[PDB]
From Swiss-Prot, chain A:
It comes from Saccharomyces cerevisiae (strain ATCC 204508 / S288c) (Baker's yeast). Present with 35100 molecules/cell in log phase SD medium. Coiled coil: none annotated. The gene is MCM3. It comes from the Eukaryota. The lineage of its organism: Eukaryota, Fungi, Dikarya, Ascomycota, Saccharomycotina. Acts as a component of the MCM2-7 complex (MCM complex) which is the putative replicative helicase essential for 'once per cell cycle' DNA replication initiation and elongation in eukaryotic cells. The active ATPase sites in the MCM2-7 ring are formed through the interaction surfaces of two neighboring subunits such that a critical structure of a conserved arginine finger motif is provided in trans relative to the ATP-binding site of the Walker A box of the adjacent subunit. The six ATPase active sites, however, are likely to contribute differentially to the complex helicase activity. Belongs to the MCM family. It is found in: Nucleus. Component of the MCM2-7 complex. The complex forms a toroidal hexameric ring with the proposed subunit order MCM2-MCM6-MCM4-MCM7-MCM3-MCM5; loaded onto DNA, forms a head-head double hexamer. Interacts with CSM1. This is DNA replication licensing factor MCM3.
Curated annotation (Swiss-Prot), chain B:
Present with 166 molecules/cell in log phase SD medium. Early fractionation of eukaryotic MCM proteins yielded a variety of dimeric, trimeric and tetrameric complexes with unclear biological significance. Specifically a MCM467 subcomplex is shown to have in vitro helicase activity which is inhibited by the MCM2 subunit. The MCM2-7 hexamer is the proposed physiological active complex. It comes from the Eukaryota. This is DNA replication licensing factor MCM7. Belongs to the MCM family. It is found in: Cytoplasm; Nucleus. Acts as a component of the MCM2-7 complex (MCM complex) which is the putative replicative helicase essential for 'once per cell cycle' DNA replication initiation and elongation in eukaryotic cells. Core component of CDC45-MCM-GINS (CMG) helicase, the molecular machine that unwinds template DNA during replication, and around which the replisome is built.
Length: 59, 63
């Protein structure tokens, strides 16, 4: 692939700032689900990407 | 010459039985009486008990 993969990789460095505010969110939702499952004696994998973090600076 | 497949001479079966007593509160779940409603997930290929009301009883046929 180099043409069909290049703007993937250039995005692969681009959108990592578009989850500066979600890279906390995506791990905080599982660390207790990993915790409570080890001490029982639950949420799906939802990563809401807003428009705002992908329209202010990528066209 | 053909040996017996192991299914020929059994004349017996197997069974299983889980637990929901204070041994679950001793130290550690797989036998909470879940309903039918929440069951479609990773609970496919496991051992789960479900309560209910039995309807549509067929007969006994030789398999």
């Amino acid at each position: 692939p180099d043409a069909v993969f290049g703007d993937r990789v250039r995005r692969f460095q681009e959108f990592l700032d578009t989850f500066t505010s979600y890279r906390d969110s995506v791990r905080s939702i599982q660390v207790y689900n990993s915790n409570n499952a080890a001490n029982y004696n639950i949420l799906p994998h939802r990563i809401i990407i807003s428009l705002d973090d992908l329209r202010e600076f990528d066209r | 010459t053909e040996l017996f497949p192991p299914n020929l001479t059994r004349r017996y079966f197997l069974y299983f039985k889980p637990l929901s007593q204070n041994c679950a509160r001793r130290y550690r779940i797989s036998s909470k009486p879940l309903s039918v409603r929440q069951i479609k997930g990773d609970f496919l290929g496991q051992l789960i008990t479900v309560r209910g009301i039995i309807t549509r009883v067929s007969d006994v046929k030789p398999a």
